[PDB]
């Protein structure tokens, strides 16, 4: 249930942003849906695996995924945040995405790993970041891991 | 909550069966607990990743993880089931446990990959199998992963 809700949220997000990623936006209907499902599920699971790896918490942001945005902070006179530059918003060291890539090759058989890294994997990375941003997912996973 | 329940179930199972695996049974309390927690969490996540891989359903047992045990079937005159020989009860092709191994080394830093494979990884495999065996876990994973 909680897992189903999380994956549904990630798939809706992926549907909203899929047009931005050339490897995904050009796909056929059924293949696109299957790919978004794979990416959402692997993003959820791989975020959990990052969070469960001892010592994986980002050393720059200490797991928040955020840093102070200097320019915006001085412009507004209030703290304005940006993605942590080291973990790019995940808060943890990243798991290799090779299994996710292989799962996608089942649906896009001519997808090479470099084309994946440049045209599809960025959507998966965005979904992992979204796991960290969405409080429901991030908190459920934190409580489960600890 | 659902994830917490699954990981708690797997962690308690791991503690119950830890005596079978020398790579963990010799550990001290805190280290053993941390290692079993890691193994349970990765077993849950990697089982999910198997179920989410297109085409991964075991082709011999069709995902049930079970098969007829021929000899025992004929010994008792009734159909007796057994773990599928190909997936060994998981119902799916297996994810590599490389991330799980690396995570474990953070708690057992001198653990070599062969010692992992012979004395620790079997407990992780048992836990993945238990994900498939425990109806609550298997059903929640299947329902979430499938569309
Ligand atoms: Cl084969
Ligand atoms: Cl196989
Ligand atoms: Zn960071
Ligand atoms: Zn099988």
From Swiss-Prot, chain B:
Q: Which UniProt keywords apply?
A: DNA-binding, Host-virus interaction, Metal-binding, Transcription, Transcription regulation, Transcription termination, Zinc, Zinc-finger
Disulfide bonds, which pairs?
A: none
Q: Where on this chain does Zn(2+) bind?
A: 58, 61, 84, 87
The residue ranges marked as DNA-binding region are: 111-132
Q: Where is this site: Interaction with host rpoB?
A: 41, 100, 105
| Positions annotated as zinc finger (unnamed) | 58-87
Choose any GO biological process term that the UniProt entry carries and state it. DNA-templated transcription termination
MF annotations from Gene Ontology: DNA binding; zinc ion binding
Q: Site annotated as Interaction with host RNA polymerase sigma factor RPOD: where?
A: 74
Q: Function of this protein?
A: Mediates the switch from middle to viral late gene expression by associating with host RNA polymerase (RNAP) so that the latter can read without pausing and through transcription terminators preceding late genes. Competes with host factor sigma 70 for binding to RPOB, the beta-subunit of host RNAP. To join the elongation complex, binds a specific DNA Q-binding element (QBE) and interacts with RNAP that is paused during early elongation. Participates in the lysis-lysogeny decision by activating the expression of the late lytic genes.
Q: How does it assemble?
A: Interacts with host RPOB (via flap domain); this interaction renders host RNAP resistant to transcription pausing and allows it to read through termination signals. Interacts with host RNA polymerase sigma factor RPOD (via domain-4). Interacts with host NUSA (via N-terminus and AR2 domain); this interaction releases the autoinhibition of NUSA.
Q: Which family does it belong to?
A: Belongs to the phage antitermination Q type 2 family.
**Name of the protein in its database record:** Antitermination protein Q
Species this protein is from = Escherichia phage lambda
Gene name of this polypeptide: Q
